[model samples]
Target: DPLNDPNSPLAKRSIYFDFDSYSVKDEYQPLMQQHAQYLKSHPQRHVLIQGNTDERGTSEYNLALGQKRAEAVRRAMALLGVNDSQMEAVSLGKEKPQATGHDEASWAQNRRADLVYQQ
Candidate 1:
């Protein structure tokens, strides 16, 4: 959920990416593995990755970037034993900004892939 217990993994499911890039830091891999394993072991878990971007490039470029970011996380999880059938990767581009402010900090927060866990 967008609102959740700060201590819960579900509370902060956003896999943030670098500005002007979709590169996820290796430092975050273990966290991804935890969720991947959860989805793998659970019977009815579903995860939808929402790829997003800051208001930087053209709309089309942003959409493409979002797709890339979402797919990267999905692919990594799939390799780590996550079944593709239970997950989805989609892009909202710059249409949904987590931080509306026009600043580097806000842009940093907006460039991310948000995960929605279900079941």
Candidate 2:
């Protein structure tokens, strides 16, 4: 599929966030726009935004922060004209780490919101 093609920017589905921040960075604007456009063009597609965080905070705090992170992405998409009905945002928190380690690099990898298209 076009989304899975490595050459496409749509393949980059993860939006990374800075530590303790839920803001969608400037670097990700184009990425978000591309995703939003894709969603707009493919009306039948549904996407799930999975928010996650590092292991530095309490489970409750991380979960809340993760939800904020997910919402951030959802807002960005909404602003870009993607339908709210096509997206669902949820927090996975620190429970699902992309990199399982006790270091900055690993933690960085975990602080992200993943945009996954449903089959």
Best by TM-score: 2
- Mind giving the per-residue lDDT tens digits that candidate 1 earns over 29-99? 88788778777887477889989999999999999999999998898888888889988999999999989
By summed lDDT, the worst window of 10 consecutive residues in model 2 runs over 1-10
Q: Residue 83 CA error for candidate 1 (Å)?
A: 0.4
**lDDT per residue, candidate 2, 1-119, as tens digits?**
68879999898999999999999999999999999999999999999999999999899999999999999999999999999999999999999998999999999999999998999
Which ranges in model 2 have alpha carbons more than 4 Å from their true place?
none
Q: Which stretches of candidate 1 lie over 4 Å from their true place?
A: 1-6
Looking at model 1, the pairs that clash are none
- By summed lDDT, which 10 consecutive residues of candidate 1 come out lowest? 1-10
Candidate 2 residue-pair clash tally: 0
